[PDB]
């Protein structure tokens, strides 16, 4: 009955709420995106990031805005953008930057 | 006789009855003419020393041979033997063997005088600890993967075109390698430096997963592919190989890449690409190199920071986090005060100042980080000085674009201002003059660092400043306001730079400093304390000489003949006032001799 | 003015009426002279409309909005909308809006109300029935992702350079789209074929992940990159774009490479790479192209069959397993028989024969597969013929592995050997000599096919042999012994070759067929069957010609200028030309050798 | 505690033992090498293939020589070599061929 087209990638705002999103996962892997609404090279990977979400439904897809979350980007040490980050449990695992659809999809498989 | 001595092999009579399975294939290859003896997976502990001359390829693999059979003979050109529990090889091997493979074995050491006609020797996954001095010169391929070798011999066959040592336990490499070498693989070793002398025909050099800090400036011009990934590389060579095609320099500790990447040369058909992912770069470097590659006028090498197209983000982290980057000491008491320091205005400006200051290579140095840490403790308790440095940091953001150096100088100069307001300088005018001379020299240095940074791509303006300050500590007598610090590099400062900077500043002090002192500065704050009377009558001497002087009408009538300038006239007479007042108090004490030429 | 606007537009007062959080950032955007409006994660239901003048860019992401605000009344050059429910686009749009963003909507159709201001407009993840017949001539970027579009209009904005479509269920393209377009993306569309004429400035073409048969021959040379991966492509185009840099044709059904990759000059400074993976390639193509890569003088493009280095391995399948390659539908009862036939001598030779024969492009055609299946069907029963078929498969592989087409011809000829020996010819010479001239013709075809290979790289010799045979079925009177078979191509056969093929084979049949027929061959089996005594007489005469008086007269003149076998093969040959011409006249059928054709 | 030298790569000799080995894996992954003696490109990735066996102790490493085991080579459709094939629960997952160290290691983590 409940079938919203609103994908499965998930928006975040409150920093504290963001931390609770990592405990809501538990053992299943998540993917964090840091994007801006003015970033050129990020526009080419933004729609695609979502496309992946529904495919790899096993993992959680979190989208973070740098401008609307100055505390988040500073805490996770964002510099290059678009920057993607993955988490299982807690602890870093891996991160990387740049506009690349291949590297993004391959990394999810490389981990899970 | 071959038939006899092979069915004789059943006379030792071990448990394995599969010994006859080998003599079956031994006869089948004689009549069918297989020109090769293929036998493995058998389980054979030993083989005869006699093989038919018809054979030329002998295969022993994946069955235990606890040791070698002494003196094999016949006509073997290639001998393969892997995955066996072997201990040693004989010195009596057929001098017709051209290729020999030994993988997953247990060889502890290599004997002497191996077959001359041997071109290929494979020794992967063994236990070789030492390598022989004189191996046969016909060798053209040597591989010792997964082999704990402390150090390689200085002499080598000099005809090897492919040497692989990627294994374990290498401290360094000899400076005398095979001149005919085109490929070297020294990955996964624990070496820290590369020899200044390398084969002049070398094309492929892989030194990944090591501990190299600096690549030698005397690198073979024939090198096309260089891999220095997974290292502790601080900088990159100014002189890259002439025929360089690709350089994998990721997983390193580069902060800024060399200034010698303009145009470079496309000696190769494929555009030269340099991959430098996962390195803590400076924002000035990433920006300027990206701005280079963005413009179509660029003809240099393509530097890859990401995968991956990107856009640099400017985000100011909270100040309580920005301060911990300078002081290593972690305590709950200290951090709490910095949050209270973050509450007042212009705190975010200073928070961004600290990050943009420590975003270079030379400012990450422990000796420089130590004095900044001390300077932060000075602001941690002195509430008055902490307020005025935030204002200076605030004006740094508005003033043009990137003036972090001058901002750092103004707040360091502001320390003397607050020392004068409280009155640390009383009758120590003779002592503050010397302090005034040093700060004057630093301003001259700052002006020199601005002229220098304009021809520099990645060298920060701070490093040029701290360079000139440290390199001229002895020459310009920077005893105070400067600590004896060691820097990783001179920051592009040449010999002619120091010889010129020295002379210019000295002459700038023999003529300008007298006036300079008067316009300065914190000294004034002493004048209103050490001589309140003269300071009041001076203020009453500028409004007295501005009411109806003749210089106004002389200029006002001169301006119209040419075509709020009265303030520009006001400052012209103020400088003359500060000069007159200074010389009066100077003669009051014995400090008047101090503002002599000095240099 | 604007104060009265929203304060009374907060009057709707829906639940979670925190629109005051918006006005707490609305004025602040005007206080600090900002042109950027950040409106995000409101827990929204409905939005104030009038607001505001002089704001270039406003962001509306993470909303639970229902539709656009009425009468916006504001100067805006950039509008971003995401992750909210929308009917469509209100016509009320100012001519100042240069770019828009709509990435998550429940939209359904085209408003086709032009700001004329727009240059960038994406429509990701929101279904639309179709596309506007004429969009503003200022549009430069258009993205249509994860939707369902049936047809594209005949005229899009003449200066669109970037067009992205990944919508499900889009099937084919307008032949003409605007020429200036240089980048196009069309994947996940389940397409069929491409237009013959593309934009003459197109440099990037992406048609990955959709099912395409064959790409058009004529393409704009401006194309530098081409992604045709994950298709069902059979033959890559002969004339590739001149400026081709990187082409990826993996996950397809390629058997052989286009012939016209001899020297393919690559304009590109970087070498031209053609990536082809996971395709059932023939051994001939892999062997030839890779060997062609080993040559330093090779200036053609880079074909990467696998990454990176590799080596071809010739593994011989078991007999019965190679049979199912020709027998698609069959019962285990057939398998148990073929596995039993594996025990006989010359077994493996025929097993490799079926593989090499079936490792081409045209021999995988269903109708030719039917013919071979029917031929294999008789063999299961026959037994007697298989032994002769297996022994000719062994003699063909010991000389050269390439000679697989000659063996196939000698296997079909083997059928007429047993029948001629099984007494299947009741004095029906006139009927068998016709099969007699055809085999002669097919032999000449093989002779033409052998010399045709020498000027080609990827085409197999069998591909050429069947090409001439099938095409010259009507012109060479190949009525019997040959079933017509439609092929995917001419197998690299020029029209001028056919003219040469007709004349040469026709003449060869008129000149030396009399000499050839006598020697061929199964007729001997028939000849032994019809006149054994005259056979023996000419056989005894052959035995009595071993002691020839002038036998030494030939030998002594050879040693000066083993050896006496060639002359022996020449003498008895003339003896078989005489026994023929004699017995053939007895049955009133010396008429038939005759002459034929012209 | 017991420990043995050498790689974890198991050399096969019979198809009956080959089929037996992949059944005694369970949920684990099985990577199979298809190399030979005379082949050059096989030697380039050969030592690196054994090093992955010591690193990845989760998955099973098997090597099948084509020359003496042609029944298995035709069974798994080997056409070129070196060819790496990956199996789990007695079923083929991914197929890859070519002397590329990068793709081999990346393909392993892609599955596990």
What DSSP string runs through B352-420? HHHHHHSSSSGGG-HHHHHHHHHHHHHHHH-HHHHHHHHHHHHHHHHSSS--HHHHHHHHHHHHHHHHH
CB atoms within 10 A of CB C584: 20
- Maximum alpha-carbon separation in chain C: 134
CB atoms within 10 A of CB B479: 10
Beta bridge partners of B184: B163, B205
CB B143 within 8 A of CB B164: yes
Please name the CATH architecture into which domain B1-304 falls.
Answer: Alpha-Beta Horseshoe (3.80)
Helix H, strand E, coil C: the string for C338-370 is HHHHCCCCCHHHHHHHHHHHCCCCHHHCHHHHH
D90 near B CB under 8 A: no
- Phi and psi for D34 in degrees, rounded to 5? -120, 80
D72 near C CB under 8 A: no
Nearest to C262 by CA among C456, C80, C87: C456
Tokens of B476: 């310009």
B269 near A CB under 8 A: no
Question: CA-CA distance, B535 to B67, in Å (whole number)?
Answer: 101
CB atoms within 10 A of CB C270: 12
Question: CA-CA distance, C417 to C343, in Å (whole number)?
Answer: 24
The vertex-A106 CA angle with A102 and A111, nearest 5°, equals: 155
Nearest to C273 by CA among C309, C238, C239, C249: C249
Integer angstrom CA distances of residue C24 from B80, C28, C149, C532: 80, 7, 42, 118
Sign of CA dihedral B25, B29, B30, B36: negative
> HSE-up of B381 (CA within 13 Å, CB side)?
5
A54 near C CB under 8 A: no
Query: What is the distance in angstroms between the Cα of D32 and the nearest Cα belonging to chain A?
Result: 19
Beta bridge partners of C274: C247, C303
Residues of D within 8 A of B39 (CB-CB) are none
Question: CA-CA distance, C181 to C199, in Å (whole number)?
Answer: 6
How many A-D residue pairs are in contact by the CB < 8 A criterion?
A: 8
Estimate the crossing angle of helix C405-421 against helix C523-530, to 10 degrees: 10
Estimate the crossing angle of helix C405-421 against helix C461-471, to 10 degrees: 60
A76 is catalytic: no
CB D86 within 8 A of CB D93: yes
Q: Which residue of D has its CA nearest to C286?
A: D80
Cα torsion through B337, B340, B341, B343, rounded to 10: 160
Tokens of C409: 């011809």
In chain B, where the domains are located: 1-304, 319-599
- Domains of chain A by start residue, with CATH: 1-112 (3.40.30.10)
Nearest to C170 by CA among C157, C183, C151, C144: C151
- Phi and psi for C374 in degrees, rounded to 5? -70, -35
Tokens of D79: 């056409």
Q: Are strands D29-34 and D60-63 parallel, antiparallel or unpaired?
A: parallel
Query: In the complex, which subunits touch B with 3 or more CB pairs below 8 angstroms?
Result: A, C, D
Q: B308–A71: do the CB atoms touch at under 8 Å?
A: no
**Cβ-based neighbours of C541, under 8 Å, separated by 6 or more:** C575
Burial of D50 (0-12, 13-18, 19+ CB in 10 A): buried
**Cβ-based neighbours of C86, under 8 Å, separated by 6 or more:** C65, C66, C67, C68, C102, C105, C106, C107, C126
Which of A6, A7, A47 comes nearest C145 by C-beta?
A47
Beta bridge partners of B120: B99, B141
Residues of C within 8 A of D103 (CB-CB) are 307
Question: CA-CA distance, C258 to C268, in Å (whole number)?
Answer: 20
Tokens of C500: 């040469």
- Phi and psi for A20 in degrees, rounded to 5? -70, -20
Nearest to C586 by CA among C527, C515, C525, C519: C527
DSSP run (H or E) holding C576: helix C566-586
Nearest to A26 by CA among A108, A88, A91: A88
Query: What is the distance in angstroms between the Cα of D103 and the nearest Cα belonging to chain A?
Result: 11
Query: What is the distance in angstroms between the Cα of B271 and the nearest Cα belonging to chain C?
Result: 8
D110 near A CB under 8 A: yes
Tokens of C227: 């992604």
Q: Can you give the resolution of this entry in Å?
A: 3.3
- The experimental technique behind this entry is X-ray
The vertex-B337 CA angle with B333 and B341, nearest 5°, equals: 165
Residue at token pair 């740049």: A98
CB C72 within 8 A of CB C53: no
DSSP run (H or E) holding C450: helix C429-452
CB C105 within 8 A of CB C67: no
Tokens of B186: 């020294």
Residues of D within 8 A of A110 (CB-CB) are 106, 109-110
Question: CA-CA distance, C276 to C298, in Å (whole number)?
Answer: 19
Question: CA-CA distance, B284 to B301, in Å (whole number)?
Answer: 18
How many A-C residue pairs are in contact by the CB < 8 A criterion?
A: 34
Question: CA-CA distance, C46 to B96, in Å (whole number)?
Answer: 89
C545 is catalytic: no
H helical segments located in D11-83? 15-23, 40-55, 70-73
Residues of A within 8 A of D109 (CB-CB) are 109-111
Residues of D within 8 A of C309 (CB-CB) are 40-41, 44, 98-99
The single-letter DSSP state of residue C309 is B
- Phi and psi for B183 in degrees, rounded to 5? -145, 125
SS3 C48: coil
The vertex-C558 CA angle with C552 and C563, nearest 5°, equals: 80
Ramachandran category for residue C492: left, alpha or beta (phi over 0 → left; psi -120 to 50 → alpha)? left
Question: CA-CA distance, C198 to C205, in Å (whole number)?
Answer: 10
Question: CA-CA distance, B94 to B155, in Å (whole number)?
Answer: 24
Question: CA-CA distance, B335 to C379, in Å (whole number)?
Answer: 92
H helical segments located in B240-331? 283-294, 319-322
The vertex-C590 CA angle with C589 and C593, nearest 5°, equals: 105
Which of B307, B311, B318 comes nearest A74 by C-beta?
B318
Nearest to B117 by CA among B87, B80, B76, B145: B76
Beta bridge partners of B503: none
- Phi and psi for B468 in degrees, rounded to 5? -60, -35
């Amino acid at each position: 009955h409940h079938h919203h087209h609103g994908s499965m990638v998930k928006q975040i705002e409150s920093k504290t709420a963001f931390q609770e999103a990592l405990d809501a996962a538990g053992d299943k892997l998540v993917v964090v995106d840091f994007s801006a609404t003015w970033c050129g090279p990020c526009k080419m990977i933004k729609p695609f990031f979502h496309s992946l979400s529904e495919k790899y439904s096993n993992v959680i897809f979190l989208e973070v805005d740098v401008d609307d979350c100055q505390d988040v980007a500073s805490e996770c040490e964002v510099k290059c953008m678009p920057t993607f980050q993955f988490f299982k449990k807690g602890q870093k695992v891996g991160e990387f930057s740049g506009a690349n659809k291949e590297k993004l999809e391959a990394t999810i498989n490389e981990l899970v | 006789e071959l038939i006899w001595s092979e069915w004789v092999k059943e006379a030792p009579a071990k448990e394995a009855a599969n010994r006859e399975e080998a003599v079956q294939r031994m006869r089948d290859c004689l009549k069918n003419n297989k020109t090769e003896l293929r036998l493995k997976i058998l389980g054979l502990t030993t083989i005869p020393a006699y093989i038919p001359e018809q054979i030329t390829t002998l295969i022993l693999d994946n069955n235990e041979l606890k040791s070698l059979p002494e003196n094999l003979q016949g006509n073997i050109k290639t001998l393969y033997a892997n995955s066996n529990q072997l201990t040693s090889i004989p010195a009596t091997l057929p001098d017709t063997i051209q290729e020999m493979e030994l993988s997953i074995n247990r060889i502890t050491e290599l004997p002497e005088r191996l077959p001359s006609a041997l071109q290929s020797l494979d020794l992967f996954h063994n236990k070789i600890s030492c390598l022989p001095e004189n191996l046969p010169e016909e060798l053209r391929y040597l591989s010792v993967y997964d082999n704990s070798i402390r150090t390689l011999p200085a002499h080598l066959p000099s005809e090897i075109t492919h040497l692989n040592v990627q294994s374990n336990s290498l401290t360094a490499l000899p400076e005398t390698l095979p001149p005919g070498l085109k490929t070297l693989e020294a990955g996964e070793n624990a070496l820290t430096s590369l020899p200044a002398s390398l084969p002049p025909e070398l094309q492929v050099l892989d030194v990944s997963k090591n501990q190299i800090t600096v690549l030698p400036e005397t690198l073979p011009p024939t090198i096309t592919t260089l891999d220095v990934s997974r290292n502790a590389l601080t900088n990159l060579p100014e002189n890259l190989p002439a025929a360089l095609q690709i350089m994998q320099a990721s997983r390193n500790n580069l902060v800024r890449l060399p200034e010698s990447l303009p145009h470079f040369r496309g000696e190769g058909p494929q555009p030269t690409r340099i991959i430098v992912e996962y390195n803590p770069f400076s924002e000035r470097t990433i920006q300027n190199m990206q701005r280079l590659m963005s413009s179509v006028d660029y003809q240099g090498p393509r530097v890859l920071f990401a995968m991956g197209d990107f856009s640099i983000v400017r985000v100011t982290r909270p100040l309580h986090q920005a301060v911990q980057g300078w002081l290593t000491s972690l305590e709950e008491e200290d951090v709490n005060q910095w949050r209270a320091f973050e509450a007042e205005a212009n705190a975010a400006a200073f928070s961004g100042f600290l990050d943009y200051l420590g975003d270079t290579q030379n400012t990450r140095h422990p000796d420089f980080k130590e004095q900044v840490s001390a300077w932060l403790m000075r602001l941690a308790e002195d509430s008055a000085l902490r307020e005025t440095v935030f204002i200076i940091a605030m004006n740094a953001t508005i003033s043009c674009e990137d003036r972090v150096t001058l901002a750092y100088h103004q707040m360091q100069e502001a320390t003397l201002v607050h020392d004068a307001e409280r009155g640390a300088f009383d009758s120590h005018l003779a002592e503050l003059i010397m302090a005034g001379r040093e700060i004057f020299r630093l301003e001259q240095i700052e002006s020199l660092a601005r002229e220098k940074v304009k021809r520099l791509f990645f060298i920060d303006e701070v490093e040029v400043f701290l360079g000139f300050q440290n390199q001229l500590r002895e020459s310009l007598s920077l005893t105070t306001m400067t600590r004896d610090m060691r820097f990783y590099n001179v920051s592009g400062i040449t010999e002619s730079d120091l010889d010129e900077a020295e002379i210019r500043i000295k002459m700038a002090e023999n003529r300008d400093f007298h006036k300079w002192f008067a316009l300065w500065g914190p000294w004034h704050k002493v004048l209103e304390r050490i001589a309140p009377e003269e300071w009041r009558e001076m203020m009453a001497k500028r409004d007295e000489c501005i009411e109806t002087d003749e210089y106004q009408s002389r200029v006002n009538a001169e301006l119209e003949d040419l075509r709020a300038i009265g303030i520009k006239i006001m400052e012209e007479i103020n400088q003359t006032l500060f000069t007159e007042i200074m010389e009066n108090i100077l003669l009051k004490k014995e400090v008047s001799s101090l503002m002599s030429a000095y240099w």
